[PDB]
Amino acid sequence: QELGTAFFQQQQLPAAMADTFLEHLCLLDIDSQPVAARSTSIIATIGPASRSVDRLKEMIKAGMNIARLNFSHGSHEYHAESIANIREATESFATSPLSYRPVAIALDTKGPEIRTGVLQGGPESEVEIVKGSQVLVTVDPKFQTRGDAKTVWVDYHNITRVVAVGGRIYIDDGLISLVVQKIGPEGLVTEVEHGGILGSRKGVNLPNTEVDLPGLSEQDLLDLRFGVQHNVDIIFASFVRKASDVLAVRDALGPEGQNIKIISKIENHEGVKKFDEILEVSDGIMVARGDLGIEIPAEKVFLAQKMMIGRCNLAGKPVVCATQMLESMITKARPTRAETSDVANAVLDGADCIMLSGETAKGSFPVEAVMMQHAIAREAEAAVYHRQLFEELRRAAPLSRDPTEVTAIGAVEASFKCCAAAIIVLTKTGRSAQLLSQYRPRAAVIAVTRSAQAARQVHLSRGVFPLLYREPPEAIWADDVDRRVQFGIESGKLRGFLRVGDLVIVVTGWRPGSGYTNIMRVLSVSHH
Amino acid sequence: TAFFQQQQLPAAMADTFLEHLCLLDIDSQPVAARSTSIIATIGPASRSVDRLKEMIKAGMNIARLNFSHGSHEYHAESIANIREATESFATSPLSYRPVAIALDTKGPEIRTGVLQGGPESEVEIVKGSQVLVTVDPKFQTRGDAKTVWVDYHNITRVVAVGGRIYIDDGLISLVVQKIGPEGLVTEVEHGGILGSRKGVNLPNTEVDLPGLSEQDLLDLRFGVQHNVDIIFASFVRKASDVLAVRDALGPEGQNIKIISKIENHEGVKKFDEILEVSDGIMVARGDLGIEIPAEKVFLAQKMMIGRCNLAGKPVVCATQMLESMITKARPTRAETSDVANAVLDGADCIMLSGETAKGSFPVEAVMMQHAIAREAEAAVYHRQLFEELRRAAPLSRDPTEVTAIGAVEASFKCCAAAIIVLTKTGRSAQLLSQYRPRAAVIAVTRSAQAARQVHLSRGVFPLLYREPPEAIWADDVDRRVQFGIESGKLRGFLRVGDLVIVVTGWRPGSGYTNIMRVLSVSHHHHHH
Amino acid sequence: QELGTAFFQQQQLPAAMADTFLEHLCLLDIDSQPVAARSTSIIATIGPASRSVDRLKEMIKAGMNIARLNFSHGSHEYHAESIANIREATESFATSPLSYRPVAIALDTKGPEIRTGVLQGGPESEVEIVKGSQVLVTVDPKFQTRGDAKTVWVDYHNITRVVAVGGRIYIDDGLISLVVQKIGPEGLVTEVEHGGILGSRKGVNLPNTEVDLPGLSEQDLLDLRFGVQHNVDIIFASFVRKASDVLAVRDALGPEGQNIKIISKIENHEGVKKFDEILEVSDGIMVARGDLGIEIPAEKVFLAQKMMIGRCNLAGKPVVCATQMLESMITKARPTRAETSDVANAVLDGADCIMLSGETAKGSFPVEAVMMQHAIAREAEAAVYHRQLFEELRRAAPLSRDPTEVTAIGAVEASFKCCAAAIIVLTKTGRSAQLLSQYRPRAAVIAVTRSAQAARQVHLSRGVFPLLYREPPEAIWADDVDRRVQFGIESGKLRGFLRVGDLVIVVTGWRPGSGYTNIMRVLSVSH
Numbered sequence A: 001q002e003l004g005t006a007f008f009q010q011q012q013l014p015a016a017m018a019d020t021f022l023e024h025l026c027l028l029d030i031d032s033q034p035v036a037a038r039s040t041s042i043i044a045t046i047g048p049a050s051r052s053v054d055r056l057k058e059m060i061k062a063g064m065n066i067a068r069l070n071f072s073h074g075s076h077e078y079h080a081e082s083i084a085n086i087r088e089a090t091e092s093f094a095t096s097p098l099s100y101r102p103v104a105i106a107l108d109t110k111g112p113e114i115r116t117g118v119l120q121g122g123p124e125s126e127v128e129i130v131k132g133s134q135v136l137v138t139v140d141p142k143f144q145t146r147g148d149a150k151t152v153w154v155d156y157h158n159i160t161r162v163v164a165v166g167g168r169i170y171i172d173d174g175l176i177s178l179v180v181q182k183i184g185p186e187g188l189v190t191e192v193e194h195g196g197i198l199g200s201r202k203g204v205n206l207p208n209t210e211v212d213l214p215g216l217s218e219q220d221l222l223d224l225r226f227g228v229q230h231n232v233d234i235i236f237a238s239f240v241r242k243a244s245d246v247l248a249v250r251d252a253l254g255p256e257g258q259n260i261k262i263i264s265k266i267e268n269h270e271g272v273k274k275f276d277e278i279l280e281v282s283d284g285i286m287v288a289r290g291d292l293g294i295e296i297p298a299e300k301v302f303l304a305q306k307m308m309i310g311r312c313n314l315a316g317k318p319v320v321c322a323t324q325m326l327e328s329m330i331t332k333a334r335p336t337r338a339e340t341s342d343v344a345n346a347v348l349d350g351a352d353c354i355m356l357s358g359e360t361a362k363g364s365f366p367v368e369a370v371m372m373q374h375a376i377a378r379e380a381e382a383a384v385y386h387r388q389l390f391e392e393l394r395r396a397a398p399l400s401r402d403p404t405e406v407t408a409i410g411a412v413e414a415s416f417k418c419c420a421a422a423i424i425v426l427t428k429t430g431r432s433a434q435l436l437s438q439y440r441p442r443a444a445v446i447a448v449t450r451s452a453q454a455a456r457q458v459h460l461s462r463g464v465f466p467l468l469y470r471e472p473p474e475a476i477w478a479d480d481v482d483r484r485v486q487f488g489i490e491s492g493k494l495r496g497f498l499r500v501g502d503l504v505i506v507v508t509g510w511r512p513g514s515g516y517t518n519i520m521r522v523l524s525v526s527h528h
Numbered sequence B: 001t002a003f004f005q006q007q008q009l010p011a012a013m014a015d016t017f018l019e020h021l022c023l024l025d026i027d028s029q030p031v032a033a034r035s036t037s038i039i040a041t042i043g044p045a046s047r048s049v050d051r052l053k054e055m056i057k058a059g060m061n062i063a064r065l066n067f068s069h070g071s072h073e074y075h076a077e078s079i080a081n082i083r084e085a086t087e088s089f090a091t092s093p094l095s096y097r098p099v100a101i102a103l104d105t106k107g108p109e110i111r112t113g114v115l116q117g118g119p120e121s122e123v124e125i126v127k128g129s130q131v132l133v134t135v136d137p138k139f140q141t142r143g144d145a146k147t148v149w150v151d152y153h154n155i156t157r158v159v160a161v162g163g164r165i166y167i168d169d170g171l172i173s174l175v176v177q178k179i180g181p182e183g184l185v186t187e188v189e190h191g192g193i194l195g196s197r198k199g200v201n202l203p204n205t206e207v208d209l210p211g212l213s214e215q216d217l218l219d220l221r222f223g224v225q226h227n228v229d230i231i232f233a234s235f236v237r238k239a240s241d242v243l244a245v246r247d248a249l250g251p252e253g254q255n256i257k258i259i260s261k262i263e264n265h266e267g268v269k270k271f272d273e274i275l276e277v278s279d280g281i282m283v284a285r286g287d288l289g290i291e292i293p294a295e296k297v298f299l300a301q302k303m304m305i306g307r308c309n310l311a312g313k314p315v316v317c318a319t320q321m322l323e324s325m326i327t328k329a330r331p332t333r334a335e336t337s338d339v340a341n342a343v344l345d346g347a348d349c350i351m352l353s354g355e356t357a358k359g360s361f362p363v364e365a366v367m368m369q370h371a372i373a374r375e376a377e378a379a380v381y382h383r384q385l386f387e388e389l390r391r392a393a394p395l396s397r398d399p400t401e402v403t404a405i406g407a408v409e410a411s412f413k414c415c416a417a418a419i420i421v422l423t424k425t426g427r428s429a430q431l432l433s434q435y436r437p438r439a440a441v442i443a444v445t446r447s448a449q450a451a452r453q454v455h456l457s458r459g460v461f462p463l464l465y466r467e468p469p470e471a472i473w474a475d476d477v478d479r480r481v482q483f484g485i486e487s488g489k490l491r492g493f494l495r496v497g498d499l500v501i502v503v504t505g506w507r508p509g510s511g512y513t514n515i516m517r518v519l520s521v522s523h524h525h526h527h528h
Numbered sequence C: 001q002e003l004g005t006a007f008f009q010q011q012q013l014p015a016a017m018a019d020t021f022l023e024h025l026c027l028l029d030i031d032s033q034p035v036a037a038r039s040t041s042i043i044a045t046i047g048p049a050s051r052s053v054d055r056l057k058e059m060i061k062a063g064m065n066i067a068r069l070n071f072s073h074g075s076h077e078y079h080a081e082s083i084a085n086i087r088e089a090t091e092s093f094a095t096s097p098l099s100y101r102p103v104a105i106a107l108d109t110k111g112p113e114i115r116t117g118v119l120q121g122g123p124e125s126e127v128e129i130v131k132g133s134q135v136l137v138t139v140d141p142k143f144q145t146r147g148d149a150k151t152v153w154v155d156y157h158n159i160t161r162v163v164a165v166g167g168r169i170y171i172d173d174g175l176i177s178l179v180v181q182k183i184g185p186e187g188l189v190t191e192v193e194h195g196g197i198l199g200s201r202k203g204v205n206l207p208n209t210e211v212d213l214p215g216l217s218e219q220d221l222l223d224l225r226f227g228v229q230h231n232v233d234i235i236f237a238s239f240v241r242k243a244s245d246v247l248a249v250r251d252a253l254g255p256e257g258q259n260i261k262i263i264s265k266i267e268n269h270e271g272v273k274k275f276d277e278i279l280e281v282s283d284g285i286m287v288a289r290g291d292l293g294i295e296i297p298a299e300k301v302f303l304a305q306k307m308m309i310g311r312c313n314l315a316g317k318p319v320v321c322a323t324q325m326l327e328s329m330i331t332k333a334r335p336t337r338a339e340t341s342d343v344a345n346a347v348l349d350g351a352d353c354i355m356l357s358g359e360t361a362k363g364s365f366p367v368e369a370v371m372m373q374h375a376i377a378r379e380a381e382a383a384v385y386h387r388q389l390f391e392e393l394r395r396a397a398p399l400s401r402d403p404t405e406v407t408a409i410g411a412v413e414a415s416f417k418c419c420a421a422a423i424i425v426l427t428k429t430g431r432s433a434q435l436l437s438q439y440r441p442r443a444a445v446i447a448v449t450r451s452a453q454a455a456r457q458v459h460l461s462r463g464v465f466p467l468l469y470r471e472p473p474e475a476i477w478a479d480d481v482d483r484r485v486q487f488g489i490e491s492g493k494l495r496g497f498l499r500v501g502d503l504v505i506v507v508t509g510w511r512p513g514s515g516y517t518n519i520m521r522v523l524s525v526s527h
């Protein structure tokens, strides 16, 4: 009502109050400055360009929420040191819960993939595959660490039997195309159709093939155990084809790994086909557009993205958009017009998380890349048409008898009614926060938890801002609850989420332990 | 399985109103408690203590006393019998049904005199005949088929030649030929059988009458003195009329609900300003259907009900709803349809006049309104209604308003059997009712008057709590909540395994409602 | 803009342009006068009160479109007299051959029903059945025309067996309730639970019983042959319980009766159960609330009504709302508040036709009952929320490869874009008009036909105004088409449907014969 005239001209609120989508579009305003904290989480792949403690400190300040460790590269020893560095940088800000941001760690698996070998000049070297040249693809292990511009080793022994003369071999998410001329004892003699810069251990994709490949290799098992031992938060499971891939991963993690979240990467035609069964048994999904867009026609990937994000939004499960989002920023300080558009559109499509790969793992501007995802996402989030979104989730979602579910829809609705600055929720596992996130409030969901791991893992859900509460239980449980709510309000103040006289929605439960969230309260923020 | 086939839920799921209509099913039994209150006019057929007990059991919520007829003593008698009948059930507080008492004013009505042959005589007014309309005192008790006396003395200076004079629910029509010293010489345009003291209507004649007459002031005084809950104020033409009623009621009468009756053209014209200053509205279809064309009344009804639904204020549909049941045991097909459509239009209350005041079947008239309303309430298209009311309601920083919408949203998500709310004045209950939930709003109150008055708001079931305050206020709050659930179970509104939403406040006194909770109803008598 | 902003204040146009239903209600305005011609057709039942040529003429002036003959009453001879008087009244206006109104004739069957006998005194007489008294229900032929306050005859010979002791016999749409005390040789001796005034030949309804009645009795077959031989337009087929019932009717009408519309009456529980298979093989539906309201619980009838009209509107097939709509006007000059509201809500529910029974058949105010239905229907039509109704039909209905379908939706959309005063359609059978009527245009459908029967029959679909074209062909077909269209336009001007400067939509076909409608044009009304 009377927060000010100015209030209703900010954060695209004229567009928010449109009666149609079309009218909503027409009312978008470049001069309407975003106000809410950026809610879509940024995942940054950690490699040579992003490994130092100093650099990780600036990536955290720029907006990094989740660090991705790609086990298709490096080694256990390398990734262990990456983790050490991440945790040093993260904990450097723990001095005062004023700038303390949890950072989650994700292990991205190799999975049923085909990779090239390490070049002659070593794992950080490159060679130029030239258009028109002859290239031998070999399976002879003597070439495993001795690849160059003429001979490429591959780790799938059976390629020779499986690829046809005149057939294509693609390298590095389709960067390089080889056409098979001849088959024989030496391997596959190819001509380079499209050339480029080949690095070490690059992905190999084979059109017109149905390679049966284990699913969990012996290396995969070592990698998941490494994950459990180093207490990673998330598994990004590569090339999930079917439900049983997800269950195999859940099995190998074991009961000690039971709390680790599994985000299934959809990277091929089969995964898209079996999406429903995959999503059912997964904690969430990654639209892995690098592999996907060379496994399926490039012009079709956007249908897959929009569909999978839609379905995850409906299921209330985290979804990640990935790969080539700000690609040009590997060598330039500013992105292309298509790249800003792609990020904005991933937020508008409804992604919980967006991701940087080469842009942060090996590029010249890792910090700028994080900064740019931050700035775009914050603008896109203000432009979501919540009215239609919320209305469509009501119409489409099932009825629920779960009291936390019921509480969360009422809490979010209440947050719109009064333009609440935040919804403060107590959560042991993240779940009560996740169930608020699914209705996409404009209000920040501030999740207060004692669980360090839950604080990291809630970054998967758009708009959940974790606060690690560190005080030991009060003598009286009601007083412990109150102190945690007050903690959320005061961190809200000091982080600029709240000010005296804002309204907040508070979501609690009626007893200790998980699953008893059933209370929604409306509070005015005051001084003491 | 069976659950989803009742309460017209197949029709409730429909994607369009059209498909909703197509899916309505006569075999789908309502299960909700009846939410549209029944106002029964009390008179000869309905004032014995025994009859009134049967009428309470049939569903009567509000007793109307029509002060167009009967002495003060006759009305005081009716009140004592109503209170006796009501209080006969008070030895069962979990089942006790409050009954409100409404005083309907005489207002500026015009009536004919007594006939020569006295108050049981009747005379034929023949069409084509000349009849004088006189205000000569000597004709007050000497009416015949050629002279009719009228109690509006100023009628002879206010009805110009060519003016129409309607008598007895508009069934007799006179057209003025001349204004003489003897009065209005007229011609019978429509004829009929005329009795004593019959209502007169003067449409397209602006009357001089005061608004509050000396009798009205006596009658409003009587109202305060006998602690009536509601004034139905006859012939409200403008906002100043409403304020005159509020002033006469005095400081003693401040809490009495004023429901303005819209009975003529000017009242429709000035509806908006009238509704502003009133607690609610009655579509008084009897007078209105003579004052304006009969074939336009349905537009005024639907307009007024809509605007009231928009304002979150109670609206009453009245007059001739089950008219035939004055003499017959079963109503006409038009009459059942009238009742159902009043509910579907959005009426909070429906009314019975002659059918309960003087007819042969008062109890069965009440039973019939009960049964129809139940069927119609199940058939309301909530999906559309809820959205349109959500969207039309303004943003609010008032926590009662914020919590109300969260609780109704929540009710809909779990198909909650009830919303239980504590209220001192009825307001927190009204703010739920205004979103038209399918769930029953069980209002728990210590105030006997509020318990009576909340019957004006659709879907509010008052429970009068009688226990002395617990020493700890939170305990007192909890006892009332558990009392609401236990009354709910006993009256069969709630069964074990149902979810209820509970609505409470953070301190004592009106205006601090701010908490919504989700409970399960257990077999046990304490719930969580 | 340049219609004059007075145009956007009449006809409930502010309410028409609401964004929501709720806003639409809030904008309804009693000072906003209707301007369109009344589109919901009025069916009047013809009996004692409506027999004379002068009376029928007045009923036609008041707005009667269909005359209903109830063969549960009278005799062949009686209805032949009625028909002759209806046609003489109808043809008395053929003088000015564009103020001629076709009037359809509907034969309403007995069907599988039970009825009481003729009283002592004859079919004009009445007796009071007194509450508490003892009444004998008998199957003895000697009481067949000898009924009184104490013995009532019924034409279901096997009634002694189907009704238990302590079971209810309802008479005249539930007006009278009898409870069976004892079962014996004379019949059933009953005590009167609810009394009332009994006439001759009143409906008997038996709750919690099954009766074995054929579907088409020997009398039904005689009555349908009568209908064919007297060139009736419509059969209102009583107590349609299943799809086979409709097909039997269609069989009995035979090749001679091919073009007669069957409107199936839904009046009991089985009929509601089997609605979908009945509507499928029927030309239309009647919601027969008299019987229906004593066969099922009275508080349920409104659900059945709204469901059935909703489904008919979706199937694009005409539906009639019937019985007790203006009941009090049997004795009173003015209706009750419930009655006006009922008529309005029938129209707002989407009924194509509204009906009068006793109000015109036997009451004191037949003409004023018709006038009242006319007045209400006209107000209610302007209050339809076209915006939502069109949208939901578009969403709900199937796609179609039929050129007439495709053209109709186009035409109606075009009618809205320009506020066309009329859509003019050429039709042989009415089908092309009907397919426009299903989208409920605010614009009048002026249907130009050479078929007198079609011109009577199209009254069944809301918004269709028939113009019977009388001229003989032109050498060139295309010239004949253009003259029929010109007839439409000049007829609309004269009747005040149209003025110079109105737009009209014109719907035509590419060749003669039925089934080839496929053209829509936008014309300015000339000179």
Ligand SMILES: Nc1ncnc2c1ncn2[C@@H]1O[C@H](COP(=O)(O)OP(=O)(O)OP(=O)(O)O)[C@@H](O)[C@H]1O
Pocket: A045, A046, A047, A048, A070, A072, A073, A074, A108, A173, A199, A201, A202, A203, A238, A290, A291, A357, A358, A361, A362
């Ligand atoms: N830990 C690392 N050490 C060295 N180089 C790395 C590391 N992580 C990533 N890279 C480099 O950055 C590139 C892009 O990273 P990204 O994580 O997308 O891997 P990818 O090879 O495309 O496989 P995926 O399909 O799993 O994304 C890699 O191809 C590799 O050249």
Ligand SMILES: Nc1ncnc2c1ncn2[C@@H]1O[C@H](COP(=O)(O)OP(=O)(O)OP(=O)(O)O)[C@@H](O)[C@H]1O
Pocket: C045, C046, C047, C048, C070, C072, C073, C074, C108, C123, C199, C201, C202, C203, C238, C290, C291, C357, C358, C361, C362
């Ligand atoms: N042709 C007629 N001759 C004499 N009286 C008639 C005739 N038609 C109708 N009536 C009178 O009007 C009443 C109502 O007319 P209506 O056509 O509704 O008949 P009904 O008995 O109600 O049977 P249905 O269930 O077919 O309507 C009849 O019961 C009868 O008293």
Ligand SMILES: O=P(O)(O)OC[C@H]1O[C@](O)(COP(=O)(O)O)[C@@H](O)[C@@H]1O
Pocket: A426, A427, A428, A429, A430, A431, A432, A433, A508, A509, A510, A511, A512, A513, A514, A515, A516, A517
């Ligand atoms: O989101 P989750 O994991 O269900 O946890 C929410 C739980 O948190 C609480 O607010 C607090 O529980 P604790 O005191 O055990 O932290 C409970 O009332 C509620 O059931």
Ligand SMILES: O=P(O)(O)OC[C@H]1O[C@](O)(COP(=O)(O)O)[C@@H](O)[C@@H]1O
Pocket: B422, B423, B424, B425, B426, B427, B428, B429, B503, B504, B505, B506, B507, B508, B509, B510, B511, B512, B513
């Ligand atoms: O509906 P109202 O009149 O505002 O009353 C609601 C009030 O009832 C309560 O729930 C209980 O108050 P009391 O103990 O004064 O009855 C308050 O917490 C709340 O403000």
Ligand SMILES: O=P(O)(O)OC[C@H]1O[C@](O)(COP(=O)(O)O)[C@@H](O)[C@@H]1O
Pocket: C426, C427, C428, C429, C430, C431, C432, C433, C508, C509, C510, C511, C512, C513, C514, C515, C516, C517
């Ligand atoms: O509505 P129906 O019976 O299908 O009639 C539509 C027919 O009327 C016409 O406009 C004219 O046909 P006729 O010339 O045979 O009268 C045809 O073009 C069209 O197929």
Ligand SMILES: O=C([O-])C(=O)[O-]
Pocket: A238, A265, A267, A287, A288, A289, A290, A291, A292, A322, A323
């Ligand atoms: O694996 C990925 O991240 C991809 O392929 O996009």
Ligand SMILES: O=C([O-])C(=O)[O-]
Pocket: B234, B261, B263, B283, B284, B285, B286, B287, B288, B318, B319
């Ligand atoms: O006073 C009334 O209730 C009326 O006139 O309808």
Ligand SMILES: O=C([O-])C(=O)[O-]
Pocket: C238, C265, C267, C287, C288, C289, C290, C291, C292, C322, C323
């Ligand atoms: O038969 C009828 O017309 C009825 O019963 O309503």
Ligand SMILES: [Cl-]
Pocket: B329, C131, C193, C194, C195, C196
């Ligand atoms: Cl009786």
Ligand SMILES: [Mg+2]
Pocket: A070, A071, A072, A108, A109, A110, A238
């Ligand atoms: Mg990988």
Ligand SMILES: [Mg+2]
Pocket: A113, A173, A202, A203, A204, A290, A291
């Ligand atoms: Mg790859």
Ligand SMILES: [Mg+2]
Pocket: A290, A323, A357
């Ligand atoms: Mg990649």
Ligand SMILES: [Mg+2]
Pocket: A238, A267, A288, A290, A291
């Ligand atoms: Mg990949």
Ligand SMILES: [Mg+2]
Pocket: B066, B067, B068, B104, B105, B106, B107, B234
């Ligand atoms: Mg009064």
Ligand SMILES: [Mg+2]
Pocket: B234, B263, B284, B286, B287
């Ligand atoms: Mg009145």
Ligand SMILES: [Mg+2]
Pocket: C070, C071, C072, C108, C109, C110, C238
């Ligand atoms: Mg019949």
